[PDB]
Amino acid sequence: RKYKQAAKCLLLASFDHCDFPELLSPSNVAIYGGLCALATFDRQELQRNVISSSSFKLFLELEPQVRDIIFKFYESKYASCLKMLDEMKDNLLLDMYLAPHVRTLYTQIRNRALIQYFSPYVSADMHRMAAAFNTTVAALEDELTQLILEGLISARVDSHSKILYARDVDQRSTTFEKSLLMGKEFQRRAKAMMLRAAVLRNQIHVKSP
Amino acid sequence: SIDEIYKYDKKQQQEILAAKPWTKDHHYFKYCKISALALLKMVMHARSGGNLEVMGLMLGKVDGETMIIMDSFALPVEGTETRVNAQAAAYEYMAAYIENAKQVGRLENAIGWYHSHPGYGCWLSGIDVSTQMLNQQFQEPFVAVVIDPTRTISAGKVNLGAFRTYPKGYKPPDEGPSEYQTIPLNKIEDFGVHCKQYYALEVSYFKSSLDRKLLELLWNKYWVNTLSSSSLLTNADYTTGQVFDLSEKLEQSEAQLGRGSEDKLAKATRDSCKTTIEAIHGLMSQVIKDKLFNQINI
């Protein structure tokens, strides 16, 4: 599950080996590799890995499906992208080896679908966007609520807006509050250790009985 | 007289110059009477030198038991702190200067080594400890005149030390200061190789009454400049470099006190308190100006 070096090799597909029936079906070869990547990557080097993929280009050209899948994925047609995503749900299941990580994959998939589109905006409107992702308004916002559980933007929603506003502005005052929290626990520890010097140097302990 | 010490008795001065008390005791020179030419271009040519190390000839003399620095300063050069006997190459300066300095009655002769480690001192490093030791077996009376430019920038005091190094054969007796100083990686090892081979001179300063009146009158219109510093903007980045350096020094104090450079934790606490004091006093002066001129309400 350290799929970083996994895709590091997946990109490394060298057709000129040209034969091993136990190796992988080139359908599975490309889908396997590139989707380990599509989990692992950050977009830039991977587009490099993808748009500027040369050694994999046959492996590239194997599945036109997954090819334009990840293409317009990074181009963000999330609707049909996710569509064929959880359509090959069943067939990755049909992979013995795609089955064991379907949850992992689809998890990080819709995660990074978020990560992809959400980053530029400032206030997450949902209406047309939900029309895209094809998640019900509640299911949409609860996806979002999930997102709240971990998300990166100091963001809030008028539900009646049916729309987020994303992360806030200041980090300075943030530093301020962490600073004061710092200082308070500092003084706390400090008295603690004063009293600790007392208890030690005052011989203090607890017997066993 | 206040001018009694400005009197350069070339007779008396060059007499004690040829006196060779150091060959009888290499600890004879305890004092270092200085005229502020050392401070003058030592300071502003270590600072104007950026970070470029320098070298050369100091004006001066000797009086009683005293080396005397009439001059010390910097070059627009480099290489010092790593040069094989750097300082020599700038002596051409008063290869000429002092000569026709005698043409104005500056009948002085060459006495020492001007220099500066812009940003990190004025001294002689490992290769310059070859310099320092070799030359004090070459050139005694010789001194490691030591003041740090950026230390004197963020410090507010001139840590001057005339370091007659203990020549080979002569160990530090009772009085060897050996000013331990945080050295870069280049020369810290060789300082540990030679940290206890020098002592300091009791560096006093001599002047005229006109000198004091001039400095007071300097202040008497510089105070306007005093309330126009804006130096928290100046080296806040310097404070940041100290940020990194200090977290690093706490890393290294960690690594030292782990199992078993002496007590880097205590030294680090010391230097941290120091540099924080530095930034805080900068903020002091700046808040001073601020609250003053901004609490002027109509």
Binding site: R172, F176, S179, M182, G183, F186, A190, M193, A197, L200 | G156, K157, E216, L217, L218, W219, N220, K221, Y222, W223, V224, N225, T226, L227, L232, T239, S253, L257, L265, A266, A268, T269, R270, S272, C273, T276, I277, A279, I280, G282, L283, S285, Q286, V287, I288, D290, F293, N294, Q295, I296, N297, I298
Partner: protein, 98 residues
């Protein structure tokens, strides 16, 4: 040893604008020339009063002093942590075999 350069320059110009003050006072007093360019500048001055009320620098100086003060807070750290390390030393000295 710093602020006395402040003190010196301020006292120098203080003598300057105080001689100013003195021959000024004489202007309104008597037997010393009546000019309209004397105080007038003083009016300019009293409208030169505390520059930047602005709240701009107000926030700015919250910034400055908070920076230096949290610096000093960390240094409450530096001081008492050095003290703490020496305490743990001597705790490993007599309570323990350091």
């Amino acid at each position: 040893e710093h602020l006395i350069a402040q003190h010196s320059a301020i006292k120098m110009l203080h003598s300057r604008v105080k001689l100013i003050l003195e021959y000024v006072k004489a202007s309104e007093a008597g037997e010393v020339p009546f000019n309209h360019e004397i105080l007038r500048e003083a009016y300019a001055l009293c409208h030169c009063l505390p520059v930047l009320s602005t709240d701009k620098f107000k926030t700015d100086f919250y910034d400055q002093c908070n920076d230096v003060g949290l610096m000093a807070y960390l240094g409450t750290i530096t001081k008492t942590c050095n003290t703490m390390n020496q305490f743990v030393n001597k705790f490993n000295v007599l309570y323990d075999r350091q």
